[PDB]
């Protein structure tokens, strides 16, 4: 063809775009892609935070300060959830003077989400949390909805309520923020470029989007071990652990993940080890005949998940026992995950 | 037993509607068109192969000049192509690569896309800086963005796996009108030519006609046995076609309020991803999981032709406003232009 001068310059631009696309493509083909799945609150976004902390030198002091309002909001909502559950369960305060504090709590909860935690609100929360009737309700939290980090913050209210409060990395790791849509982070480790994707808030039919992740290197499936004793909801079909098993069954055996490694994070082992001391595993699995030790109960849960694999002879599940908020544990486990990925390809 | 009294009343209303529909089914489209000649030899050839995506292509949309088009791929790129020369005009790097839809604004000033980020991102093609910039991230859906179409530079309609569609004010970033009533993921939407109505197809196996300015569902169309993945208006705006996981396409008429025709072959059992009419409405083009595009005679239901040029699912297609070409986009990372 005999191109005009502007046409020639447009072709030249297109060829430059092509060189960029080719280069981007070479980098992308080297990526190790990790897909984080699991029920809401299983610990997925906490694992993402840990990758930033461990491999991206993330959550500096200055970034941690932006989580102050979230810490406060988590703290306030937790004590409110407990107070509201007392009216529902007919639990009375250990001291009748706390009824005023409870009224004030809802009133002082008209302050915005800023640097709140006025000394007045903090004192109202500290007195309620110390009340024996509130503690009795807190110890029945398996009967309502309550952030797993409730005790963590409320037990540290003195440090947290100081006007010079600077959130720690563990404070940040303990926060609960519900989001929608895919959450992503990238990092380099042992000369592999990792891209980790947390599907996150996704209210839709899995069958319509799961094929998009055909070709990911590995799935990390998070399970909240401590969900095992949660009372059924109003119209809930099965308990939370069985809903997790249903999701895992669907994922592990999906035709689109045939050449994808399945990694199982049996998470919140720290909370599970405390709960199993007082709440038997038969609440979750009525047929369970073992003892309620951490070791036996954790092994049984692992078995229940791994038995869902319909292709045991051709596919292997890599199970880890994790505390997602514990940076050293996640570092050690992800190191092992990485070695397995290296040895397998 | 209030829920009992209501659940039974809906069954009677469905029966009334079925009876009203049967009452005006005085003939079938097939018998009405029996006399007209078949279309015959539809021999379309690939006139262009658009190369440069490096992963599955999930969506495309022609600009209204019938020359530029935008395509969206899981390689994290939104590419605007000059289809006449195959020159890449822009290659836009996406913040999230898990895209499912893109759209070209009729003005040519903006494109949109989105996917598993649950966000409809608006991209300004005419910046002072000379490159393409995200001008808005439309947030508020709680499931994936499955489809979107601009009404003009300040309003856009979206469909989502969260079972809603929404009309957005792009300037303010707010959903200003919502379209609720589907009970399963909404997969696809199509704007009427006058933009006063749009139709949606969902995983409740129904299609719904929506009144844009009133914000409600005018009509609901059933008949499909599985998800409706794709939907497109007939060019005069009085009918539309769907494409389904049940391996059929179907033609629905608005004013007669019912299905008119099914397009299927007994040995075609795979899903349909995409549908489009030719300019006159005579041809219904549909993209299939079996890597082919089938061309149906929309009036007589015979298959007229095949476009077989991809090595993986045909995921999207579109016909230019001037009618001169059809584009196919594919999981095999290529787009092809045919006529």
């Amino acid at each position: 063809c005999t191109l005009s001068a502007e046409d020639k310059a447009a072709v030249e631009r297109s060829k430059m775009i092509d060189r960029n696309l080719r280069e981007d493509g070479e980098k992308a083909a080297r990526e190790v892609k990790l897909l984080l799945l699991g029920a809401g609150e299983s610990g997925k976004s906490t694992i993402v935070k840990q990758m930033k902390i461990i491999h991206e030198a993330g959550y500096s002091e200055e970034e941690c300060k932006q989580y102050k309002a979230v810490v406060y909001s988590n703290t306030i909502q937790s004590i409110i959830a407990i107070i509201r559950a007392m009216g529902r369960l007919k639990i009375d305060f250990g001291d009748s003077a706390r009824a005023d504090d409870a009224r004030q709590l809802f009133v002082l909860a008209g302050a915005a989400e800023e640097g709140f935690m006025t000394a007045e609100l903090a004192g109202v929360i500290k007195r309620l949390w110390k009340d024996s009737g509130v503690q009795a309700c807190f110890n029945r939290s398996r009967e309502y909805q309550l952030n797993d980090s409730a005790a963590y913050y409320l037990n540290d209210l003195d440090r947290i309520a100081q006007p010079n409060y600077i959130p720690t990395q563990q404070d940040v790791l303990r926060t609960r923020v519900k989001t929608t849509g895919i959450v992503e982070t990238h990092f380099t480790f042992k000369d592999l470029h990792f891209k980790m994707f947390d599907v996150g808030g996704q209210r839709s039919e899995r069958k319509k989007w799961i094929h998009c992740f055909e070709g990911v290197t590995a799935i990390i499936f998070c399970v909240a071990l401590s969900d095992y004793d949660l009372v059924l909801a109003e119209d809930e079909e099965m308990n939370r652990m069985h809903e997790s098993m249903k999701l895992f069954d669907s994922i592990c055996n999906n035709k689109w993940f045939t050449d994808t490694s399945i990694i199982l994070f049996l998470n919140k082992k720290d909370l599970f080890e405390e709960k199993i001391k007082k709440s038997p595993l038969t609440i979750c699995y009525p047929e369970y005949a073992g003892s309620n030790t951490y070791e036996e109960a954790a092994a049984y849960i692992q078995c229940q998940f791994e038995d869902l694999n319909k292709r045991k002879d051709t596919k292997e599940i890599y199970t880890h026992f994790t505390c997602a908020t514990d940076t050293k544990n996640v570092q050690f486990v992800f190191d092992a995950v990485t070695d397995v990925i290296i040895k397998n390809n | 037993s209030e829920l009992d009294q209501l659940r039974q009343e809906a069954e009677q209303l469905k029966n009334q509607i079925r009876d009203a529909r049967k009452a005006c089914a005085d003939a079938t489209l097939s018998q009405i068109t029996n006399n007209i000649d078949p279309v015959g030899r539809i021999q379309m050839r690939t006139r262009r192969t658009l190369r440069g995506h490096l992963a599955k292509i999930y969506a495309m949309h022609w600009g209204t000049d019938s020359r530029l088009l935008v395509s969206a791929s899981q390689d994290g790129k939104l590419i605007i192509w000059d289809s006449y020369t195959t020159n890449k005009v822009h290659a836009i790097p996406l913040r999230s690569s898990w895209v499912m839809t893109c759209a070209y604004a009729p003005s040519g000033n903006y494109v949109a896309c989105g996917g598993l980020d649950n966000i409809c991102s608006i991209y300004n093609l005419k910046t002072r800086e000379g490159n393409v910039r995200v001008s808005r991230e439309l947030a508020g859906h709680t499931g994936y963005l499955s489809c979107c179409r601009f009404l003009d530079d300040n309003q856009i309609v979206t469909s989502s796996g969260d079972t809603t569609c929404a009309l957005w004010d792009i300037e303010t970033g707010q959903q200003t009108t919502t379209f609720t009533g589907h009970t399963g993921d909404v997969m696809s939407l199509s704007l009427a030519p006058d933009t006063r109505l749009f139709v949606s197809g969902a995983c409740d196996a129904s299609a719904k006609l929506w009144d844009v300015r009133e914000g409600m569902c005018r009509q609901t169309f059933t008949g499909h046995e599985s998800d409706i993945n794709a939907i497109c208006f007939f060019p005069n705006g009085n009918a539309f076609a769907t494409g389904s996981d049940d391996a059929t396409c179907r033609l629905f008429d608005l004013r007669a309020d019912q299905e008119l025709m099914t397009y299927s072959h007994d040995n075609i059992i795979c899903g349909i991803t995409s549908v489009s009419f030719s300019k006159s409405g005579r041809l219904l083009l549909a993209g299939y999981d079996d890597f082919n595009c089938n061309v149906w005679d929309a009036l007589k239901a015979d298959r007229a032709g095949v476009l077989a040029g991809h090595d993986n699912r045909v995921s999207c297609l579109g016909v230019t406003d001037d009618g001169m070409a059809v584009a196919t986009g594919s999981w095999d990372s290529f787009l092809k232009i045919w006529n």
């Epitope: 005009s4 502007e6 447009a10 | 005009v89």
Partner: single-chain antibody
């Protein structure tokens, strides 16, 4: 905010050397082709050199080949013009101009403020013709400026590669029309361009105050790029 700031001008003896610089900010510098256009003291615009985006393509005007070198430093967002063997005919204001080329783009849409260079004492090209050198006008009236080319500027692709610029008194040229009929961004709809092949017309409706200045046409069909002599709009 798009900025192009030329520097390096000054007084130089004939036969000497001088490097001009053009510093870019507020846009994706490396995506744009870049030109140098110069203007002798009481004269029109003359294209000097071009370096494409990516530096793959470089063109010089004949009167400058061998002596001037155009280069760019994309990481430092800078355009250069290295001049040598400076002659008296090089005395001019030197403009840096950005130009991006893709389907539907608007080339030549931003010009720098210019830097002044003064040198002391001691055919096949397309000809663009504006036969009328000046025109007196009164506000509110309607004007028609004319331009002609020695070759057809209408290409087999359908585009006609004709540009109109306005230089207001004391300011840099401003793009008005690209490819004979497209209104540049920010230009009021009272301007419009038309023509066919070898004859073109710029028309202003209800001429306003700011419209006074010199109007140049330019062909972008082929290099060297060439301007008309310019038509001035005087107030009555």
């Amino acid at each position: 905010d798009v900025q192009l700031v030329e520097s390096g001008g000054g007084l130089v003896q004939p036969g000497g050397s001088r490097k001009l610089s053009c510093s870019a900010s507020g846009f994706a510098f490396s995506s744009f082709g870049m030109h140098w256009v110069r203007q002798a003291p009481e004269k029109g615009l003359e294209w000097v050199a071009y370096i494409s985006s990516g530096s793959g393509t470089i063109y010089y005007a004949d009167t400058v080949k061998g002596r001037f070198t155009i280069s760019r430093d994309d990481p430092k967002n800078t355009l250069f013009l290295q001049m040598t063997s400076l002659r008296s005919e090089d005395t001019a204001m030197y403009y840096c101009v950005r130009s991006i080329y893709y389907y539907g783009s608007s080339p030549f849409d931003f010009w720098g403020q210019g830097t002044t260079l003064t040198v002391s004492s001691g055919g096949s090209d397309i000809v663009m013709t504006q036969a009328t050198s000046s025109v007196p006008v009164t506000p509110g009236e309607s004007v028609s400026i004319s331009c002609r080319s020695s070759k057809s500027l209408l290409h087999s692709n359908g585009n006609t590669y004709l540009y109109w610029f306005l230089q207001r008194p004391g300011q840099s040229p401003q793009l008005l029309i690209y490819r004979m009929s497209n209104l540049a961004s920010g230009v009021p709809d009272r301007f419009s361009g038309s023509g066919s092949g070898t004859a073109f017309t710029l028309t202003i409706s209800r001429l306003e105050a700011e419209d006074v200045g010199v109007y140049y046409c330019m062909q972008h069909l082929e290099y060297p790029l060439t301007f008309g002599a310019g038509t001035k709009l005087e107030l009555k």
